[PDB]
């Protein structure tokens, strides 16, 4: 622990408690002195100080009293799904069951029923036929007790059976009511005023098609009409509805849904219940992309023979199919076609009759989208890429997401086991298959092989044996997993390539689950920090105990309409008035909450010290609620990105969090004392957030002095057949005679990857913009997971990336001029480069496409520096001739070298190299002399700035755009017609009375040293306390 303080991190009084405490999973002081209590609830009972711990004690106790009641009558121990199903329940909570298909749905909700049932409530089950109503009612008469009051309506009933379940209801002598959609449909009303605890359905399309059905199931649970019309109004004008606090509703429980709810009543359950009906899009997958370069029907037949059985064959057009299904019919093929006869073709498909079966490619195509039967489907074959037809012109382009559905019918989750599939591709057209490998790894992150690469034996071997472990009845190992990152768009990523079944509205935060082979994975976003300093209280919200420093944090609240953030705790925003806050207490609550739930929690914010420390915070206030947390480092935003990251999970790296207490100590008591100087003087306040601030603004005042001083002559000298020369002072002659010329060969080596200092002056200075935007571009192209971590100090390259390059130039043909190159061997990170082989026309096309479209054309042009930038880097040697030319202007001997020819290609592919023209020994002829000055010494620009920061060890990649930006906020600079950066008057004063009294403490000496230290701490090289104390007796001289 970093022995911090919390003012909401008891889980006890709500209150303040400590940071070790917290760790340790204990309330504060206040609540329980005792530091190794025998048990937390019954010390908190005996000091007679128990006010919210009893909430997870009677929480425990319900789920472990729920999971022993099923296991004692099912005999199994709750699945991983259940779990997460039966703490739910507990806990009074309505949700959809997002998993996949199985007997373990309708077995829970009948086992959840039974014990409402023990405790005296009553449930309802709803099912789309009568037959599952009486396969149920049999279920629960065998295993119910006796006592239990079990009814059911349905059709084929007994004359005495019907009227016995009416007079039950009537009477309220009943406790679970078993009957049909069709008793829904039907009896809207006499259901609509009675409330029940519970209620099952395990069709959601038959509610679906009623939006009068949709409103029974909300009456049903205890909902008001005046609520409804408040709701559908809110909805229907296309906002989201607040529920009055007071309303006590029903448990809804769907099973599962084939999630087409087109209209807005679905969405009722979301604003009422806290619960999205699921659009299940599920995305595990386990498919071998094969290309196969020809048409050859030979090796169509050859393939075939090697796969004998569950293959489907898709064909671009219908004509083609007929000519396959006629070709393979002569040939001694079981085969079977879908474009006439679809239903008798594919039941004999599913029993066996037929080993091959034929359809054309639809987006939507029943054979491409509408079957679903792993176990018999195991291999789809292309005969033809599939393709669209792209605006007005003829163009044509692939169809990637009918890709993506014909193929992934031979893979999804079956049986808790996820099979394998094979999908092979015949396409004579190498651009069109290109064409599609890019785009599915857009999508899928998922390569295409070549045919020379395939072990078909191997492959069929793989499938065969998946299937086998799928069909025997399999020991569970699911698992309830919770991601936590602190970026909203960050989590948009994520529910691409996890894929958002439903989606939850947990008080201020939504968190999104989705299938996976490992269980269910629950993940949220923060929308950034939860906590920050104390504005108030010892020194600048520091406290001093035991001759230590307690740094004492509190929630963060952000102004949903001025933006405005503060830490006090307060109902309006204290600039505008506004109660639309966006209050990060709530936040916590909501986190705390979900912890209870779920099994295992990791913790994925930023790889960096800021990112390190908001990890601790979330940490240490979850603990005192689960055990299980655990934090992992994403680099990239993708699947491999993900998988990287869980494979190195590790705790919390309590050294990058003292690194990030001390930087913000020392911007916190170096800007308050500061800014409280110039307060006096110049009446505005906050006029300084930090050493670094000064610094910089010292730069640009003083550059103004020396830039004058630095002014020498030049004279510009245009030479026919020849550039142009620039030469000092005032030159006569109008000749220039060359003397000496030499020609010799080099081997150019290339520029190394960008770093966060690099890229941001390299970017800013071409595309015309300032660090801030580029720094803002940078990190969205990380955050939705096309570039590497963008906070980097390291040109470390690792063999992934290089991977990549030799992906890329494979492809393009120019596998020869690669050459990989892991650049620095230190750096915590690598440097800013691609995550996957795409370069930015390819992105471009994809955009004006619409395959992508959240990307701008700035983000587009960033990217593509990027991409040029780390391929450079990744290729080999360029070969060039240059000229060391000699020449005498007035008596003056001047060298000149520039490169005119270039033997052999390399990195100049993506970074342009300029040749000039061939010189020779003669004298040549000056056509035009422009005289003009230009001073030796130039004006910073923003993009030197950043890199003046670096050279001279100021500033970090964290701060480098921030530091430049600040300085235009406060007026301190502006920028004239060329870009360049130029101190204000008020800004000039205001670095005057710095530099004339404080200049021991913004002098860049001081300021350099601080940083080492700084960086000391994060490697854990200087102590934590110490620092603190060099930055007390710094700021205490001032103080006074
Ligand atoms: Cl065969
Ligand atoms: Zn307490
Ligand atoms: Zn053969
Ligand atoms: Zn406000």
Same mark, same amino acid.
């Given at each position: 622990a970093v022995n911090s303080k919390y003012h909401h991190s008891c889980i006890n009084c709500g209150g303040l408690n400590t940071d070790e405490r917290n760790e340790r999973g204990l309330p504060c002081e206040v609540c329980l002195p005792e530091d190794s209590p025998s048990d937390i609830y019954r010390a908190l009972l005996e000091r007679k100080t128990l006010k919210e711990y009893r909430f997870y004690h009677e929480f425990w106790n319900e789920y472990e009293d729920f999971r022993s009641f099923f296991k004692k009558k099912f005999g199994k121990d709750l699945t991983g799904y259940q779990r997460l199903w039966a703490k739910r329940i507990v806990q009074g909570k309505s949700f959809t069951m997002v998993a996949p298909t199985g007997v373990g749905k309708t077995t829970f909700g009948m086992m959840t029923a039974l014990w409402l049932a023990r405790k005296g409530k009553k449930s309802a089950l709803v099912f789309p036929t009568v037959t599952l109503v009486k396969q149920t009612l049999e279920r629960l008469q065998k295993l119910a007790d006796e006592k239990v009051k079990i009814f059911g309506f349905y059709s084929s009933m007994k004359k005495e059976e019907k009227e016995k379940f009416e007079k039950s209801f009537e009477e309220d002598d009943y406790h679970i009511l078993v009957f049909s959609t069709q008793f829904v449909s039907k009896n809207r009303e006499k259901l609509s005023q009675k409330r029940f605890d519970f209620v099952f359905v395990d069709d959601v399309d038959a509610v679906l098609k009623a939006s009068r059905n949709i409103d029974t199931l909300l009456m049903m649970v205890g909902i008001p009409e005046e609520i409804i019309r408040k709701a559908f109004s809110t909805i229907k004008q296309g906002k989201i509805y607040e529920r009055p606090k007071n309303l006590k509703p029903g448990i809804l429980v769907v099973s599962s849904a084939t999630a087409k709810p087109r209209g807005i009543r679905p969405l009722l359950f979301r604003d009422l219940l806290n619960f999205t009906v699921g659009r299940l899009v599920s995305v595990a997958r386990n498919i071998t992309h094969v290309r196969i370069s020809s048409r050859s029907k030979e090796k169509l037949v050859e393939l075939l023979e090697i796969f004998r059985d569950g293959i489907l064959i898709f064909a671009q057009t219908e004509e083609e199919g007929k000519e396959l299904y006629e070709y393979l019919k002569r040939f001694k093929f079981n085969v079977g076609e879908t474009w006439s006869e679809f239903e008798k073709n594919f039941e004999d498909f599913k029993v066996g009759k037929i080993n091959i079966l034929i359809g054309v490619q639809a987006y939507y195509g029943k054979l491409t989208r509408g079957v679903d039967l792993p176990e018999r489907i195991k291999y789809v074959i292309f005969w033809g890429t599939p393709s669209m037809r792209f605006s007005l012109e003829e163009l044509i382009i692939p169809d990637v997401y009918t890709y993506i559905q014909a193929s992934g019918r031979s893979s999804r989750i079956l049986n808790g086991v996820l099979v394998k599939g094979v999908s092979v591709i015949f396409e004579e057209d190498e651009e069109i298959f290109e064409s599609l490998k890019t785009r599915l790894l857009l999508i899928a992150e998922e390569e295409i092989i070549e045919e020379a690469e395939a072990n078909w034996k191997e492959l069929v071997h793989e499938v065969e044996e998946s299937r086998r472990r799928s069909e025997r009845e399999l020991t569970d190992t699911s698992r309830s997993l919770l991601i936590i990152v602190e970026s909203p768009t960050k989590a948009e990523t994520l529910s691409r390539f996890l894929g958002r079944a439903s989606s939850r509205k947990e008080r201020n935060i939504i968190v999104h689950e989705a299938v996976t082979g490992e269980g269910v994975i629950l993940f949220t976003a923060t929308r950034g920090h939860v906590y920050d300093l104390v504005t108030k209280g010892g020194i600048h919200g520091v406290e001093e105990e035991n001759g230590?420093?307690?740094?004492?944090?509190?929630?963060?609240?952000?102004?949903?309409?001025?933006?405005?953030?503060?830490? !006090?705790?307060?109902?309006?925003?204290?600039?505008?008035?506004?109660?639309?806050?966006?209050?990060?207490?709530?936040?916590?609550?909501? #986190?705390?909450?979900?912890?209870?739930?779920?099994?295992? &929690?990791?913790?994925?914010?930023?790889?960096?010290?800021?990112?390190?420390?908001?990890?601790?915070?979330?940490?240490?206030?979850?603990?005192?609620?689960?055990?299980?947390?655990?934090?992992?480092?994403?680099?990239?935003?993708?699947?491999?990105?993900?998988?990287?990251?869980?494979?190195?999970?590790?705790?919390?790296?309590?050294? #990058?969090?003292?690194?990030?207490?001390?930087?913000?100590?020392?911007?916190?008591?170096?800007?308050?004392? #500061?800014?409280?100087?110039?307060?006096? =003087?110049?009446?505005?306040?906050?006029?300084?957030?930090?050493?670094?601030?000064? $610094?910089?603004?010292?730069?640009?005042?003083? =550059?103004?002095? %020396?830039?004058?001083?630095?002014?020498?002559?030049? $004279?510009?000298?245009?030479?026919?057949?020849?550039?142009? *020369? !620039?030469?000092?002072?005032? &030159?006569?002659?109008?000749?220039?005679?060359?003397?000496?010329?030499?020609?010799?060969?080099?081997?150019?080596?290339?520029?190394?990857?960008?770093?966060?200092?690099?890229?941001?002056?390299?970017?800013?200075?071409?595309?015309? *913009?300032?660090?801030?935007?580029?720094?803002?571009?940078?990190?969205?192209?990380?955050?939705?997971?096309?570039?590497?971590?963008?906070?980097?100090?390291?040109?470390? &390259?690792?063999?992934?990336?290089?991977?990549?390059?030799?992906?890329?130039?494979?492809?393009?043909?120019?596998?020869?001029?690669?050459?990989?190159?892991?650049?620095?061997? !230190?750096?915590?990170?690598?440097?800013?480069?691609?995550?996957?082989? @795409?370069?930015?026309?390819? +992105? !471009? %096309?994809?955009?004006?496409?619409?395959?992508?479209?959240? +990307?701008?054309?700035?983000?587009? =042009?960033?990217?593509?520096? &990027?991409?040029?930038?780390?391929?450079?880097?990744?290729?080999?040697?360029?070969?060039?001739?240059?000229?060391?030319?000699?020449?005498?202007?007035?008596?003056?001997?001047?060298?000149?070298?520039?490169?005119?020819? @270039?033997?052999?290609?390399?990195?100049?592919?993506?970074?342009?190299?300029?040749?000039?023209?061939?010189? %020779?020994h003669r004298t040549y002829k000056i056509k035009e002399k422009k005289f003009y000055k230009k001073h030796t010494v130039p004006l910073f620009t923003q993009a030197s700035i950043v890199e003046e920061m670096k050279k001279r060890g100021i500033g970090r990649p964290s701060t480098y755009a921030k530091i430049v930006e600040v300085l235009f906020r406060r007026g301190y600079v502006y920028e004239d017609k060329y870009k360049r950066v130029r101190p204000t008057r008020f800004g000039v004063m205001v670095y005057s009375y710095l530099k004339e009294r404080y200049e021991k403490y913004v002098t860049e000496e001081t300021t350099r040293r601080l940083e080492e230290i700084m960086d000391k701490v994060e490697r854990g090289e200087e102590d934590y306390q110490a620092t603190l104390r060099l930055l007390y007796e710094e700021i205490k001289s001032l103080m006074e």
């Open positions: 230590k420093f307690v740094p004492v944090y509190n929630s963060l609240k952000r102004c949903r309409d001025c933006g405005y953030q503060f830490t !006090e705790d307060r109902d309006e925003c204290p600039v505008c008035s506004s109660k639309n806050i966006d209050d990060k207490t709530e936040t916590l609550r909501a #986190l705390r909450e979900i912890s209870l739930e779920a099994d295992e &929690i990791l913790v994925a914010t930023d790889p960096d010290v800021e990112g390190e420390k908001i990890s601790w915070d979330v940490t240490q206030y979850l603990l005192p609620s689960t055990r299980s947390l655990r934090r992992i480092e994403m680099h990239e935003i993708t699947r491999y990105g993900f998988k990287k990251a869980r494979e190195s999970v590790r705790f919390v790296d309590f050294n #990058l969090v003292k690194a990030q207490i001390v930087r913000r100590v020392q911007d916190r008591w170096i800007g308050f004392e #500061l800014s409280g100087k110039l307060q006096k =003087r110049f009446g505005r306040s906050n006029l300084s957030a930090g050493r670094v601030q000064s $610094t910089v603004l010292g730069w640009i005042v003083e =550059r103004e002095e %020396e830039y004058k001083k630095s002014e020498k002559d030049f $004279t510009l000298l245009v030479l026919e057949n020849g550039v142009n *020369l !620039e030469v000092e002072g005032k &030159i006569a002659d109008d000749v220039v005679t060359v003397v000496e010329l030499q020609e010799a060969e080099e081997e150019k080596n290339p520029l190394p990857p960008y770093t966060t200092s690099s890229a941001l002056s390299e970017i800013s200075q071409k595309l015309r *913009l300032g660090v801030q935007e580029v720094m803002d571009i940078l990190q969205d192209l990380f955050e939705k997971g096309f570039i590497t971590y963008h906070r980097t100090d390291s040109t470390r &390259i690792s063999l992934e990336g290089q991977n990549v390059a030799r992906t890329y130039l494979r492809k393009i043909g120019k596998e020869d001029i690669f050459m990989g190159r892991s650049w620095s061997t !230190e750096g915590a990170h690598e440097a800013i480069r691609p995550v996957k082989p @795409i370069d930015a026309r390819e +992105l !471009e %096309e994809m955009i004006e496409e619409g395959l992508i479209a959240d +990307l701008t054309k700035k983000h587009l =042009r960033v990217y593509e520096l &990027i991409f040029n930038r780390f391929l450079a880097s990744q290729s080999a040697a360029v070969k060039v001739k240059k000229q060391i030319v000699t020449v005498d202007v007035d008596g003056k001997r001047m060298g000149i070298e520039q490169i005119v020819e @270039i033997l052999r290609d390399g990195w100049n592919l993506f970074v342009p190299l300029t040749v000039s023209p061939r010189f %020779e």
